[PDB]
Amino acid sequence: ARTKQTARKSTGGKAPRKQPHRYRPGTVALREIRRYQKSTELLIRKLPFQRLVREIAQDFKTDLRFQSSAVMALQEASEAYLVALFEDTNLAAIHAKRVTIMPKDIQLARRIRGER
């Protein structure tokens, strides 16, 4: 008889203890294709991005301060890398008679790009 424990608590009562107009799907999407293509501002909210860099650089060297311009350089570079990769993916999709990027479409692009 297989058994498993899920309460994960040796005792109960742990708390009591001492310790309308609507557009068709895609029209708004193309409108803000135009919006984010005519625009130049930076699309990954900064703070969250900076943090991504702190928790990931931590591995290579502790106590590594980053000049502000640097995390802005990492953002720009990351958004440029991903917009280039996403142009390629859309192509890797429009190739297969489709209009929806899918994970496979990007595991391939990166193989032809040779980034893998």
Partner 1 sequence: LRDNIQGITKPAIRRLARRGGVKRISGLIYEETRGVLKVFLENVIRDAVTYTEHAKRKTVTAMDVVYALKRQGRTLYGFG
Partner 2 sequence: DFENEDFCSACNQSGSFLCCDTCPKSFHFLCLDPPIDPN
Partner 3 sequence: KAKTRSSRAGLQFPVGRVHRLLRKGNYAERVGAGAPVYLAAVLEYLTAEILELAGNAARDNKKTRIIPRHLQLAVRNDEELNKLLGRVTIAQGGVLPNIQSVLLPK
Pick from 17, 112, 109, 1: nearest CA to 9: 17
Please tell me whether residue 32 binds partner 3 under the rule CB under 8 A.
no
User: Judged by CB under 8 A, which of 97, 99, 100, 103 binds its own copies?
Assistant: 97
CA distance 31 to 37: 10
Binding mask 33-72 for partner 3 (x = CB under 8 A): xx--xxxxx-------------------------------
User: Judged by CB under 8 A, which of 56, 70, 83, 112 binds its own copies?
Assistant: 112
Q: Cβ(94)–Cβ(77) under 8 Å?
A: no
